[PDB]
Ligand binder design. Structure first.
Ligand SMILES: [K+]
Ligand SMILES: [K+]
Ligand SMILES: [K+]
Ligand SMILES: [K+]
Lengths: 197, 197
């Protein structure tokens, strides 16, 4: 009885952790959009202070071009990857929410239909059998909602540990390939600057 | 005469390019502060979803720690380096601005004192000599402002090309060392995640 109240405390928590992760992942993606655009303004002012063309304009426009492409693709891979995966995972929660509440009421109706056992503690056989049909009906409805959730709540909580683990794995790996690749483009820009000065 | 008007058009432009570069460099630094804090929130939610301690918490807290240090130091090196250098360079402009205007008026006073040559086209010797003292005085004042600026305006415009060049050199080099170093820390996080899953 109290074992299910423990599954609810675990569900309501797992839901908060997940919506918090979505918030902070939307915060991280917005900031990446912010450094991309801010970095692009900086490269554009360089392109203005370079006319006509001196000591490698073709190796400045190319660097500035594929830098924007790296930022552009990295943001999108996080949007279409780890953010979408987290949205679909959180979409599981509103239906389970409605059913946890439905079961709770179906439990009251079961316990009210059951406590009406005073009827068979006199008896009117036509009213006993009428109450039996309303008790058996209440027991089958409660057990339909309860049987499913008793499985689904500890089964969602189990895939929780490996869910946060897989999200951060794919994020850190997209980061690593973006930072390792942009570091090279940044170095090419430096090497073109040293050619000038 | 018109050669100095060309030095002013070059000064007023060089001032706009510089204030624009400061704007866009303050934009780039603000966004870096934004990705640092957003990345830190993301690592903090990981630290929450990790209790008690499993498959390397000491190699997650360390990664998250020195990631913040890289972001922290990179932002500061741009603040104390290339942004300060650009602020001090732009601080040269308001005084030169005041003197370009001062000279322009001193030129009118010179030309008004000079055009008063009609006095020696009759003559009153006491009024000629009085006008001479006011013409010679106006010529020495104009030439004091003009001689300096005739040097200082093409001398500031010359250090312009190599100024933007040195700013972007130091920026791209701080970027490159930050991105190359964070790419390694990001990879360590991935390697600790794979250990778990
Ligand atoms: K863009
Ligand atoms: K840049
Ligand atoms: K901080
Ligand atoms: K991260």
């Amino acid at each position: 009885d109290e074992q299910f109240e423990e599954y609810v405390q675990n569900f309501k928590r797992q839901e908060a952790e997940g919506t918090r992760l979505q918030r902070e992942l939307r915060g991280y993606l917005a900031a990446i959009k912010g450094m991309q655009e801010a970095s692009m303004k900086l490269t554009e002012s360089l392109h203005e202070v370079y006319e006509p063309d001196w000591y490698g304009r073709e190796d400045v426009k190319m660097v500035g071009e594929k830098c924007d492409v790296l930022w552009e693709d990295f943001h999108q891979k996080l949007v279409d990857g780890s953010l979408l995966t987290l949205d679909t995972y959180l979409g599981q929660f509103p239906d389970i929410k409605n059913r946890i509440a439905k079961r709770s009421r179906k439990l009251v109706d079961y316990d009210s239909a059951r406590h009406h056992l005073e009827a068979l503690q006199s008896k009117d056989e036509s009213r006993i059998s009428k109450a039996e049909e309303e008790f058996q009906k209440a027991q089958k409805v409660f057990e339909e909602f309860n049987v499913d959730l008793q499985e689904e709540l500890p089964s969602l909580w189990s895939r929780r540990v490996g869910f946060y683990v897989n999200t951060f794995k794919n994020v850190s790996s997209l980061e690593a390939k973006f930072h390792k690749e942009i570091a090279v483009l940044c170095h090419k820009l430096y090497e073109v600057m040293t050619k000038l000065g």
